[PDB]
Amino acid sequence: QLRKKTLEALSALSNEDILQKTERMYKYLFSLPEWQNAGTIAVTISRGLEIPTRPVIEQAWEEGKQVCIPKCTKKMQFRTYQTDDQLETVYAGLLEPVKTKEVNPSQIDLMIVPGVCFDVNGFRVGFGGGYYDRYLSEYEGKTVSLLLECQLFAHVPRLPHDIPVHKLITEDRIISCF
Amino acid sequence: QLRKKTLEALSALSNEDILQKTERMYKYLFSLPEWQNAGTIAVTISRGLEIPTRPVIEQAWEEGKQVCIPKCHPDTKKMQFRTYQTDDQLETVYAGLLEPVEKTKEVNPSQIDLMIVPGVCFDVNGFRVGFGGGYYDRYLSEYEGKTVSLLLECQLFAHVPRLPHDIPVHKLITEDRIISCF
Amino acid sequence: QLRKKTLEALSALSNEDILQKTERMYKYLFSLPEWQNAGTIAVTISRGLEIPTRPVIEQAWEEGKQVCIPKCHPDTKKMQFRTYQTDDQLETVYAGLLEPVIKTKEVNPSQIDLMIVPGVCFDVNGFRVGFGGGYYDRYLSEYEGKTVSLLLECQLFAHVPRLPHDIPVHKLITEDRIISCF
């Protein structure tokens, strides 16, 4: 029940805490070569207790690189997301991001992967969807996951199809693996 | 199998978790009569993910207790504890920048009240998975005094390989429970 | 002596920074003739604030090179390098949760091609400040092979308190440059 133990951990954190912990997280993210040399980064739109991603998309758009959000039938496809002066509105769950652009995996250079629970070896507890569990076996680029330390555990229920994320960045440090 | 699990477990912990848990761990150890009364202590210089033993040494000298660390023989499985004179360079030592130097007149097992025993894995029965070379396996068999082990809950297991002529540690101190297997 | 400074300067370095610096040191090392041409390499298992050696052992093996680590004796300045076979638990060893299993297969000096010499304080002349044992100051005196020592700039000093006795290493190598000693 790692899903339960985390919901509690994340729930205990105050808006100030999360906002203060994620700052140092983005710091690490952006300080990686994988972020600097990335011309196209893939990412989801944060929600609830999911790590906030707005500062990521905004940063990317500020450095000219292109960003594509997911649009997930256990099949998931990524499509470019042109800069809009209403990203805030979108994160407020008051607008949809709006195609012929079926952006192939090979064209994206960095994959920011979402998750609920993580392992020290890159394994994760999905949201129940099952998309990021299969899209990774189709992907072969650089993958990373931003998460709080209260989301990181010793071991996570593995599956004969589970593919680990390459890097794990937290508010305290950063971790490598496969 | 177990050694590896304890690696992932100890790695998964944040620096805050560790700092926290080990803090209550030390309080427990310092609240015990065997420690309160111990006038000379045996302990090792921790490293890596091993439970940090710096505060155990500092607290000792702070209470005017003797402190002796282990001097292992890479020769055989023979080990011997030597008195360790209070050192202002303890910090420098626990950082790998200084090897702790009265190497004369060895400290006999009898002259050692308490003895913090380090280990990688432990079962609730006081049995443990050493670092290898089983230096303690034979030392403990010739030691009669009190023996307590500091460790985190993720180092504890239902059971570990116990091959005859293995002696369990009398006390286990973790982040939660305080096992006293006799 | 002034190794206190090295302690402060080292422990002050951005944790994430040491990783980046050690990298450049590694690249400098691996593209070296004295390295690519060495069959057997002497190195040590690093710890604490010392320079991380894992990448060096891991790389030595990946290029099918022999690797030997020390197993120096106590109360004496006797150090003898012994072969260390590819260890899939290498990470467990660096975590301090498993002593490196090596058994005794002595490797004489003339059998060592390249030797990574550990140190806390260095000077541009290849002179170093050991950890205290004085094993290297005694081993290097009778080693006629190549010697290289990796280190962060905050370890290198314009000059290190020497004494009329043991020799300095042949080549220094930091995160900024490589220094050949006369």
UniProtKB/Swiss-Prot annotation, chain C:
GO terms for biological process: folic acid-containing compound biosynthetic process; tetrahydrofolate interconversion. ATP binds at residues 1-3, 130-137, 166. GO terms for cellular component: cytoplasm. It comes from the Bacteria. GO terms for molecular function: 5-formyltetrahydrofolate cyclo-ligase activity; ATP binding. The keyword Cytoplasm does not apply. Coiled coil: none annotated. Pfam families: 5-FTHF_cyc-lig (PF01812). InterPro entries: FTHF_cligase, FTHF_cligase-like_sf, NagB/RpiA_transferase-like. Keywords: ATP-binding, Nucleotide-binding. Belongs to the 5-formyltetrahydrofolate cyclo-ligase family. This is Uncharacterized protein YqgN. The gene is yqgN.
